[PDB]
Amino acid sequence: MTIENMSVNKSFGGWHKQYSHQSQTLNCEMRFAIYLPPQASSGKKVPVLYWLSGLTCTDENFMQKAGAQALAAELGIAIVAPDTSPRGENVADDEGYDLGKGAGFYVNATQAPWNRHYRMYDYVVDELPKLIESMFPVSDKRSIAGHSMGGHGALVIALRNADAYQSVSAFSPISNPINCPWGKKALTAYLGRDSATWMEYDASVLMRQATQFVPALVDQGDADNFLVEQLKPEVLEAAAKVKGYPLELNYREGYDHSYYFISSFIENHLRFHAEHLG
Amino acid sequence: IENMSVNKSFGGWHKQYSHQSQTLNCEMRFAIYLPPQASSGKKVPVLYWLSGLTCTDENFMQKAGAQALAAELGIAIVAPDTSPRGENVADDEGYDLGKGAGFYVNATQAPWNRHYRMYDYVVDELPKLIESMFPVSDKRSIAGHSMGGHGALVIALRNADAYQSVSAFSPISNPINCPWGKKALTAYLGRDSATWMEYDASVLMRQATQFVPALVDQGDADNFLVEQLKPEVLEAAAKVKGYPLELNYREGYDHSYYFISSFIENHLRFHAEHLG
């Protein structure tokens, strides 16, 4: 498992770093970003928040635009931002913004040609966390969060792995991918048509049958253009009523889908995770 | 004027406007952050932010994380573009000349004198436009990065009564004596240095009679520090007449918005103090 620094920018007394490594799970070369807070350099091992980004994103978007480093440094949380898909000339793609590169939908693809590289689930749950721990001053305590496609992945991963994560939050998540266009196209391509394996990757289906509980916080913009068609936050609200799952879901009046929304509430999300990580 | 886009941000509004500039003879884009207090009937003061080479109005708005403390302190922020834009506008495919590279001067040389009056745009046309179209007071400060830092200090030093305070991140301190500055000044104003002296932060500061409170942060691991930015000349220029310049070298900090973001809070509080 070969890894090399690509970049370093000091940030609020700590360090934003990009690395490339050879991913065995994704069978390709991957870029991720880490933010280490000032308390990482002062002997203390810090908790980690994994951040999953949405369609079209790389690791750069969150790190540059979310404004999270300031409160990560004050609270003492490492942030890890993976990429959104395998990358490389051998990696299956689709010209569509909503399928392929930038669009791995945090699943383990079983169908060809996707099954050659698209194991973004295994990468985020298994490989990346073991690589981070062996390399950086991070504790065993981890949480997960993300935006849109990334909110889908964060919720799915936390609901399937409740022992391994202390908390989960999401902005504008794809709540019910088995019944929305983005969801249907990508789960069709990667898992096969209709296919019961879809139910392993749908937050609102999983939250209904859920046993062990992970505290969940969800922020949704009122003025988000994808609210009705893609995101379906009200299906996640209804999923939580079945078992009494610990979901807090907030509708923010006038907020859109953008990093201007995310940046506006990332503090609150960071305090919520610091609470459960502490 | 036309509102191109709008995004709620920290209880207020990030907005992109395009308008037709008479001073630049082209279609211009600027961005404004209006804090919550703007929609509470109180006229807010304005910080103008000038960006560096290759930037639009989007870089500072998306990367600096200034909205949280602007919303807290009640400051409106205006980010002009860094040059004229449009296929009617003269360009050079060099990154350090023409589009994205205005150097905040009034060009007198062809082909540049038709479009490249970014000094006039920032000092006259844009503020008259902000004050007529937005609930803002006539109180303003100016700040910038690199080329924008050069632009901020030069504008403040030459318009001392118009600006309450000035700050900069990694300014081009002494443009008459760096490659970026000579190339742009030669192209925009011609080869005779006598016309450059009015566009050099260090030269103006050394002769300054009227003080505008000044704060500068410089990352000491900045790849442009030695060749282009020359902060040491701005320190030396402040010693001559006792200019109120606070200048910090920040250990390990680079040129990027990771540096700017790390200290933008100190800058917003500096400007709040002087705007109030």
Residue numbers in the entry:
A (entry chain B): 1 to 278
B (entry chain A): 3 to 278
From the paper:
This enzyme is involved in the glutathione-dependent formaldehyde detoxification pathway, which prevents the negative effects of formaldehyde by a series of enzymatic reactions involving formaldehyde dehydrogenase (FALDH, S-hydroxymethylglutathione dehydrogenase) and SFGH, which depend upon the spontaneous binding of glutathione to formaldehyde. In this study, we characterized a novel cold-active S-formylglutathione hydrolase (SfSFGH) homolog from a psychrophilic bacterium, Shewanella frigidimarina.
The crystal structure of SfSFGH was determined to a resolution of 2.32 Å using a molecular replacement method. The monomeric structure of SfSFGH includes 12 α-helices and 9 β-strands. The catalytic residue Ser148 is located in the short β6-α6 loop region and directly interacts with His257 located in the β9-α12 loop region. In addition, the oxyanion hole comprising the backbone amides Leu55 and Met149 can be observed at the neighboring active site. Especially, the β5-α4 loop region (residues 83–112) in SfSFGH has a significantly different conformation with a relatively higher main chain B-factor value (27.9 Å2) than overall B-factor value (24.7 Å2).
